[PDB]
Amino acid sequence: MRPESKYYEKATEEMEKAYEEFKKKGEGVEDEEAKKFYDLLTEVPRIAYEQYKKILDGEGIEKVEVDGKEIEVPVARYEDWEKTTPLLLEVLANLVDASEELKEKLISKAKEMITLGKKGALETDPEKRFEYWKKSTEKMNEIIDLLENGFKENLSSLKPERKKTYEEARKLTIELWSKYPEIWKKGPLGEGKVPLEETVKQFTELDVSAKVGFGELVLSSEAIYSGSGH
């Protein structure tokens, strides 16, 4: 087994348990609004499970030549992110009843953020690799700027419980997402300070926090039910 195989195994298992758990809890939820939250936050770990499973199953990796060495890049994980980051932002958008314009902008930027990062990951030219990372971080910064701007995220309209859940969920999102570029930077595709193994491990831990942790936080909320948010 390759050093990083165990963290791909861990992620697969962890996501599968989360998917099954959320799905089970949601099966008894008949509220129209809450069912939507269960739907999105069940789908997110399901996708992660499927994509990590592909890696585990010997698909979803591409080799990229870096500094004379071949790096096994998990392209399947980028395809996961490309799908789940917009869904997670859709959850935040729904919590604060954001406009269509704002929701679509967030979703767009998330997709672009991951597309750029994946382009970076597959670049053999170090200068182009950095550039793609930089452009991706700019999309991430734009997302965070939108989330943080209190004029754009009108909260005055929310019930206390709902506002609190939003604040917690937004804080978690910003804390976690901000860490992804730093792991990338320190890993084999960036500075090469941290081995691939450690990099994979740290990403799996973020992913679990970002999907399972975030899912548990929102789904355990009293504020996702009809007439409970506004």
Ligand X SMILES: *C/C=C(C)/C=C/C=C(C)/C=C/C1=C(C)CCCC1(C)C
Q: Which residues bind ligand X (CB under 6 A)?
A: 81, 84-85, 88, 113-114, 117, 120, 133, 136-137, 140, 177, 180-181, 184, 207, 210-211
The residue among 96, 108, 104, 87 whose CA lies nearest residue 215 is 87
Q: How far apart are CA 66 and CA 13, in angstroms?
A: 30
Minimal CB distance residue for ligand X:
117
Strand partners, 73: 62
CB of 129 to ligand X, least distance (A): 10
Minimum distance from CB of 84 to ligand X (Å)? 4
**Shortest distance in whole angstroms from residue 153 CB to ligand X:** 19
- Between 8 and 177, CB nearer to ligand X: 177
Report the residue number, 130 or 225, with the smaller CB distance to ligand X. Answer: 130
Cα gap 141→132, rounded to integer Å: 14
Least CB distance to ligand X at residue 205 (A): 11
∠ at Cα 52 (191, 115), nearest 5°? 55
52 or 166: CB nearest ligand X: 52
- Distance of alpha carbon 153 from alpha carbon 103, whole angstroms: 11
Nearest-5° Cα angle at 74, 72 to 78: 150
Nearer to ligand X, 71 or 158 (CB): 71
